[model samples]
Target: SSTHRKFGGSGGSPFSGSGLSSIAVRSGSYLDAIIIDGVHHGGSGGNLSPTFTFGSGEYISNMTIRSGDYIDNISFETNMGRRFGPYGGSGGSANTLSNVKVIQINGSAGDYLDSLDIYYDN
Candidate 1:
């Protein structure tokens, strides 16, 4: 099937809109439940938020999301910052994140972090 090769179509993108470029999202072993995709601001149906993010070279392993969901601008691997609310869901209620920022990771030369980067912001 045809993959992707979008090169300067509109005045909207050149590259790096983040998420799904170069094609790599692995869960090859453990994946109980992961539905990471939600952000449609124009074809609305009460559009929630947060669509595709996990530091740079995004490599999320296993899985554990408690469900009283509120994941915003996150990069949690030894806690470099950007982690908020209802982590280990027991009851589930508390979700609202805005303007998150934290950068000081070298993860041996991987860069840029994203939580809800719908269109270029790096």
Candidate 2:
């Protein structure tokens, strides 16, 4: 019923040994929402990364994100290090991380990706 996609950045650890750095990365969406959620755009994608900065007051109320492709997994990311946490108990870099977890959620009918650390804040 829904589709997703991923856009991997210049693939590299910007913080050297620390393996912590911000990078410009994103995804080529395979779906688009328009016209007051009344219209749907298929295959006509958009960016999924370079998302929000350190403080993105986001909240999730029963939702799921997927990796658009069905054959090969889609890997979309950015500023990987500026983010952290698979548990809802740890405070990220600067309490930037709130309720987060490592779980890939497939749509009503989509691919089940691996154990990845994804999350949202309250």
Candidate 3:
């Protein structure tokens, strides 16, 4: 119960806000969704999935999206110094991201690339 409550506090974008936080859903726990907002970093959403979406032209690092998490559709025009957008350090998914939408922006950098980083500890 507490475990689900703890992890399931992250990706509830459309199903959003507080209800996502309630420890009622019996499904496996989902980490907070790292959402791309006005500033850098992000706001963690409900516990439906553990996914993330980067922005305008910000910075992202040490990101890990679990198998169940889902990133709502996030689109960036290009990349910046290969900073923002869709990408990963070692390269594509090693595991089967069965239901997750991972956006890793790469070079060709531009636009949304000039934005910001969604702040967070993890």
Candidate 4:
């Protein structure tokens, strides 16, 4: 059982994947790029955030995002209660999603992460 939801603007190349293991983002004033399970998406710029590794049985349970024309910042909370950044700079409107098991992520990216989508089950 899963649900797909869209967020942010529609631009850049489309990207998608499932089976969450680990993630990292390159960001500064805006989200520059993201790496999921070693797969890279978006442009090459900004500094890389510390990789957020997921332990066995761990899954994303919540998220906080800042966005306007593009994804500005993001944060994650795991089922095990581990928290991983507010990566990227402070900009855009803040948004939140809770009580989710993030099984997949789909989005568009270019020089900056333009859009985001999440597929989850809870």
Candidate 5:
């Protein structure tokens, strides 16, 4: 079975898909932009976070997000125990998604990362 969860706001162009091969983000006080599978989302600003590449058969099993009006920070843990980021600022409330494999990512973005809709399955 699959499930989807939403976070952050409702502005900017929407983006969604599965087959997550890699992730990159540009962030500072807030999540400036995110790159998924080399496709860019959001505006062009902030410093670029180190890209997170998925190994063969690797899948995201957990996530930590910090958000308020905009996306603050995000991090991930893969099935192989590899960790990626705490990218973005240090403010906002902390939210976690655990014990699930993230198969798809849905989100909106503009000058900043507006929101995220995480699609996962156990």
Candidate 6:
């Protein structure tokens, strides 16, 4: 059995727009390998973007990120009968998830509490 969580970012963008503009890993269930897409770190015209900081002792299976404006579909398969697909970007400014379609993750069994906190600007 497996679990999944997905959401469309604000204003149709991915990880963009005001309020909290940082990524912090409190603890538990994280990805080992990551694939990022969309704008670029700190995308658009802001000074914020999706940033990841993992120390060690974390084993995550597959990951797929989809947000911002990017192209080219891709896929990956694990030797243990696990498959990752249609994975998607990152920054120059705060990535806006508003205009985005899908954002997915294959792992994350434990609670991180503040994985990616979102707050409004206006």
Best by lDDT: 5
Order of the predicted models by lDDT, top scorer first? 5, 4, 6, 3, 2, 1
After TM-score superposition, what is the CA distance of residue 33 in candidate 3 from its true location, in Å?
3.3
**Model 3 CA deviation exceeding 4 Å by range:** 1-30, 39-66, 69-78, 84-122
Q: In candidate 4, residue 117 scores what lDDT?
A: 91
lDDT over C-alpha atoms for residue 45 of model 5:
93
How many clashes (backbone atoms < 3 Å, residues ≥3 apart in a chain or on different chains) does model 6 have?
Answer: 29
Where does the lowest 10-residue lDDT sum fall in candidate 1? 105-114
- Per-residue alpha-carbon lDDT of candidate 5 for residues 21-116, written as tens digits (9 for 90 to 100): 999999988899989988888888999988898999999999999987788999999999999888887888889999899998889998899999
**What digit string (tens of lDDT, one per residue) describes model 6 on residues 52-74?**
32223222233333322222122
Weakest 10 consecutive residues of candidate 4 by summed lDDT: 1-10
| TM-score of candidate 2 on Cα atoms, chains taken together | 0.20
lDDT of 4 at 42: 84
**TM-score of each prediction:** 0.20, 0.20, 0.20, 0.92, 0.94, 0.21
Off by over 4 Å in 5: none
Off-target runs (Cα >4 Å) in candidate 6 are 9-43, 59-122
Shift of residue 64 alpha carbon in model 6, Å: 18
Q: What's the alpha carbon RMSD for model 2?
A: 15.6
Comparing 1 with 6 on lDDT, the higher-scoring candidate is 6
Clashes of each: 0, 3, 27, 0, 0, 29
Better of 3 and 5 by lDDT: 5
Give per-residue CA lDDT, model 4, range 20-111, as digits (tens). 88899999888998888888888899899989889998988998889888888989999999998889878789888889888888899987
Pick the winner on TM-score between candidates 4 and 6. Answer: 4
Model 2 accuracy (lDDT, Cα): 0.23
Please state every model's RMSD to the true fold in angstroms: 15.9, 15.6, 16.3, 1.3, 1.1, 16.5
On the 0 to 100 scale, the lDDT of residue 10 in model 6 is 27
Candidate 1 clashes between residue pairs 3 or more apart in a chain or in different chains: none
> How does each model score on lDDT?
0.22, 0.23, 0.23, 0.86, 0.89, 0.26
